[PDB]
């Protein structure tokens, strides 16, 4: 039979059968209970709208993501999300399909063990396998080397790989991602008068960020230009009218990636953690990693980031090496495409964690040889 | 619109590939010519050593 390539993510759940080009169903991972009282009788009001249904009734819900930073903080809601994904968005019972979840690097063990225990006890799948979210993004590019920066919505991690041999001592995981950029944008919009507070209006700020923000090639020059002319002010129409005008908030929101001091984080930007991740590698594979830097994940879709990052790394790196940044147009679904490719391989067909194996060793089987 | 963006992206992929190939070829020319000129210098020194041996 065919395998189910699910990809929990944090912000958008992407799923679909193995062997295709794009995920079949992509929908936000939010579960929102209603918060008001409700007076109409017999309206058929449910107790929790999940997935894309709660992005249409969000006016009277309190949306809450079940995955904070890669890790899962609310297991009941995550179980509800998985149940919805299997039964309503794909309509395939899990009793007859292997599953291939994905997990960020350096995550707590208990999260992974609970994930496999749920998949084997509640949904009762035949066999499931957990894979690191960066190796798949490297599969999708058709490479076999390269250092991949997978800046998702929950957590940004940077896994270097050479000739198929991952370097476990050079993984640099940073917890700045799309959600923190949304919060920072929502916080700097208040400097013009627009106040978004409700958890429903966070979605509106996210839409503003997606449609308007861009990464500046040079930050100081843009700050000077936006403060003199008015060629940058782009307007946007809220879900009820009252258009708003975003000035130099456009390139200040995604600039947080390269200067995490804006949101008070100490660490260095995504332009310098990649160079540090490279320098921890051996001295003989640094040229190949320099030449095959891969971008993935949703947050790396800002217009103009593949040039800013290349300029920064070229500034840091030695002058002789060639710096090349692979930015495929299908960046958002790169991890899932790689997952489909991996699940479609014949050599991989014996790596699944078969159910009888789980019955013999318990949930701690995932840390064992079947990784 | 829709198709126009994709066509622009194709025109940009051609741009990147052609530019990268040009740069790589230029680096190859620099390296090869340096090799040749160093070999020529070695040949010159051998001629001078032969001259000393002849003396």
């Amino acid at each position: 039979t065919t395998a189910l390539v699910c990809d929990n993510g944090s912000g958008l759940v992407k799923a679909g059968f193995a062997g295709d080009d794009a995920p079949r169903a992509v929908f936000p991972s939010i579960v929102g209970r209603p918060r008001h009282q409700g007076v109409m009788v017999g309206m058929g009001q449910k107790d929790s709208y999940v997935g894309d249904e709660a992005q249409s009734k969000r006016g009277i819900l309190t949306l809450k993501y079940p995955i904070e930073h890669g890790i899962i903080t609310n297991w009941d809601d995550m179980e509800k999300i998985w149940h919805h994904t299997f039964y309503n968005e794909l309509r395939v019972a899990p009793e007859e399909h292997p599953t291939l979840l994905t997990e960020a690097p350096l995550n707590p063990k208990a999260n992974r063990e609970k994930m496999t225990q749920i998949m084997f006890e509640t949904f009762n799948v035949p066999a499931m396998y957990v894979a690191i979210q960066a190796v798949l993004s490297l599969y999708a590019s058709g490479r076999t080397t390269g250092i991949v920066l997978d800046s998702g919505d929950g957590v940004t991690h940077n896994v270097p790989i050479y000739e198929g041999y991952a370097l476990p001592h050079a993984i640099m995981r940073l917890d700045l991602a799309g959600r923190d950029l949304t919060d920072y944008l929502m916080k700097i919009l208040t400097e013009r008068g627009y106040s978004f507070v409700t958890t429903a209006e966070r979605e509106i700020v996210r839409d503003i960020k997606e449609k308007l923000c861009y990464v500046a090639l040079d930050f100081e020059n843009e700050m000077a230009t936006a403060a003199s002319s008015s060629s940058l002010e782009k307007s946007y129409e809220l879900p009820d009218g009252q258009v708003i005008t975003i000035g130099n908030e456009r390139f200040r929101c995604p600039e947080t990636l390269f200067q995490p001091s804006f949101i008070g984080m100490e660490s260095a930007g995504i332009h310098e953690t990649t160079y540090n991740s490279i320098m921890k590698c051996d001295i003989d594979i640094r040229k190949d990693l320099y030449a095959n830097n891969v971008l993935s994940g949703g947050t790396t879709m800002y217009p103009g980031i593949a040039d800013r990052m290349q300029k920064e790394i070229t500034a840091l790196a030695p002058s002789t090496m060639k710096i090349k940044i692979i930015a495929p147009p299908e960046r958002k679904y790169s991890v899932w495409i790689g997952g489909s490719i991996l699940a479609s391989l014949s050599t991989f067909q014996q790596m699944w964690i078969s159910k009888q194996e789980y019955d013999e060793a318990g949930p701690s089987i995932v840390h064992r040889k079947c990784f | 619109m829709d198709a126009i963006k994709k066509k622009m992206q194709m025109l940009k992929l051609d741009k990147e590939n052609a530019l990268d190939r040009a740069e790589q070829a230029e680096a190859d020319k620099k390296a090869a010519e340096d090799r040749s000129k160093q070999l020529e210098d070695e040949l010159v020194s051998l001629q001078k050593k032969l001259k000393g041996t002849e003396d």
Binding site: G142, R143, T144 | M1, D2, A3, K6, K7, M10, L13
Partner: protein, 66 residues
């Protein structure tokens, strides 16, 4: 590896562009001219309705004026 990049890239490098150009051409042809012609037709019908309304209003005002 790196040999499926050709067979997954070069395909859509031309087929996708040509197909989207075809879609745009057919959609524009189907949409714009038919919409403008239909709007002109509806405008003519609207003018005829306006004439009928004026005639009826005037005759009723003529009779009813007492």
């Amino acid at each position: 590896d790196f040999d499926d990049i050709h067979r997954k890239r070069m395909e859509k490098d031309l087929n996708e562009l040509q197909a989207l150009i075809e879609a745009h051409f057919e959609n524009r042809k189907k949409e714009e001219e038919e919409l403008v012609s239909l709007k002109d037709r509806i405008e003519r019908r609207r003018a005829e309705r306006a004439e009928q309304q004026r005639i009826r209003n005037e005759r009723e005002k003529e009779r009813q004026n007492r």
